[PDB]
């Protein structure tokens, strides 16, 4: 819920760990009509394939969930994702400081707490 993608991108810079990119052509939704798969789509597809390979069953498309997915995710991918990169992240009104703020335990309210943090 508090995961945000600009944060994830800066963490992916500051890690120094390689990030397991896929091959060049495997990312394309069918013949370029859907486009390049976004990172969230690839992660979800990996999770579904792991689930199917574990249970030895392939999920039939439920009517309501499939209709909701085709109405929402495909339209959002066409509107925001441009060549595998989504730009609706900047049009969104969510706030980074809500996640980046300490907001709870170890918020350093006490002056002696600040002194202990300095020490």
């Amino acid at each position: 819920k508090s995961r945000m993608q600009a944060m994830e991108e800066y963490i992916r810079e500051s890690s120094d760990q390689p990030d397991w990119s896929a091959s060049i052509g495997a990312d394309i939704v069918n013949h370029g009509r859907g486009g390049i798969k976004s990172l969230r789509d690839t992660e979800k597809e990996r999770r579904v394939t792991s689930f199917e390979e574990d249970n030895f069953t392939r999920l039939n498309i439920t009517n309501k969930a499939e209709k909701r997915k085709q109405k929402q995710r495909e339209r959002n991918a066409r509107m925001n994702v441009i060549g595998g990169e989504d730009f609706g992240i900047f049009s969104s009104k969510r706030k980074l400081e809500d996640s980046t703020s300490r907001r709870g335990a170890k918020k350093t309210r006490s002056a002696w707490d600040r002194a202990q943090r300095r020490l």
């Binding site: 993608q5 600009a6 944060m7 991108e9 800066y10 091959s23 060049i24 052509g25 495997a26 990312d27 394309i28 013949h31 370029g32 009509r33 486009g35 390049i36 441009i82 060549g83 595998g84 990169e85 730009f87 992240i89 900047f90 706030k95 980074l96 400081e97 980046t100």
Partner: protein
């Protein structure tokens, strides 16, 4: 923090898309971006620029007739946006007669008719 993190994110993904250069990593350069910068990333334009086609219309015809394969898969949409990692791998499909495959139906009919004429 909003400016720091989202400006860095926006600049990085614009670079990965390819409309923004590697040395042009500023928000004012993001502002100075224009429509033609995105239009040069179209697969029709990219095929023409790489020189697989003699024109943009020939490039569109090649793409819609499925000779062009970007990476592993054949792309048949001329409006496919091409990234920095993909622009080197744009090439003719293996199934295409232009790159490494059997000739098409026109050449096969012509060759069969010529063979029938030679037999006659």
């Amino acid at each position: 923090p909003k400016r720091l993190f989202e400006g860095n994110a926006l600049i990085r993904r614009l670079v990965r898309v390819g409309v923004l250069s590697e040395d042009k990593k500023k928000l004012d350069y993001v502002l100075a971006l224009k429509v033609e910068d995105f239009l040069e990333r179209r697969l029709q334009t990219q095929v023409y620029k790489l020189g697989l086609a003699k024109s943009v219309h020939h490039a569109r015809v090649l793409i819609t007739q499925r000779h062009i394969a970007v990476g592993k898969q054949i792309v048949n949409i001329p409006s496919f946006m091409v990234r920095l990692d993909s622009e080197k791998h744009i090439d003719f499909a293996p199934t295409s007669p232009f790159g490494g495959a059997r000739p098409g139906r026109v050449a096969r009919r012509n060759a069969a008719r010529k063979a029938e004429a030679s037999g006659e």
